[PDB]
Homo-oligomer: 146 residues x 2
């Protein structure tokens, strides 16, 4: 009842969140000239994301909830991209944690697993950025004032 349709409600948010993530990454990847590791990483996550929402959509198809309708719409952009990248990966964490709860409460244990697995990838990814972060910042600085 309200359990399914709250789960469906948050499933739809995420599906759309994953599409925004996929475009935000598929576009941060385009700007990288100086961090093959960084760039290499984001590319791998653009593919992982595509598989997330497709997983989310299987969950929306299962519970009869519909599948959200697409919306359109000395440079610093790389240091600050790693910063927004990290914050969105935490937006995602929080959301998926709270999905595992809306799934458990709804007794949809299969949905809950999907969500815990997507969650671990966001954690994995977020971890990748905040560790490699410091080097990216420094190299930026040393390069800028060369």
């Amino acid at each position: 009842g309200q359990s399914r349709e709250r789960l469906v409600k948050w499933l739809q948010d995420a599906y759309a969140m994953e599409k925004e993530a996929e475009t935000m990454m598929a576009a941060m990847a385009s700007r990288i000239e100086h961090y093959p590791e960084l760039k290499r990483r984001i590319e791998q996550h653009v593919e992982e994301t595509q598989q997330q929402s497709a997983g989310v959509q299987r969950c929306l198809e299962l519970l009869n909830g519909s599948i959200p309708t697409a919306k359109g719409m000395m440079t610093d952009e790389v240091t600050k991209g790693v910063g927004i990248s990290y914050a969105f990966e935490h937006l995602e964490i929080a959301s998926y944690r709270a999905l595992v709860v809306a799934a458990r409460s709804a007794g949809e244990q299969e949905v809950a697993q999907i969500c815990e697995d997507i969650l671990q990838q966001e954690i994995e990814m977020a971890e990748w950025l905040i560790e490699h972060q410091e080097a990216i910042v420094v190299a930026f600085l040393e390069r800028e004032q060369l």
Copy 2:
């Protein structure tokens, strides 16, 4: 140029803190059912006012300018709170690097102290997150 990148990222963060302050000074008023939460956010609405003023003392020191210009609310806002505090972290960590590179050790200490508050605050949210979600759910399908 070391100074002017430090000033540049100091400028961003001041505007960030001022957005943070106005976003929390709003979030804390939507709360009706989470006493600890409301009471925690309030406390940081002011930790925050003490942050940017600190940032400003840094902007004034380095001769840089000071920048210019049922339904979901609760759990979702908790999620955005946690994401922003994490935006902040990253930004203050990068400041600690730019301060250091620029040989402004005292600016760095400030940035490291604000970094500790954002970690402590994001820590408070994600620990208490699971309860807010659970109580929200339970409540809405009584």
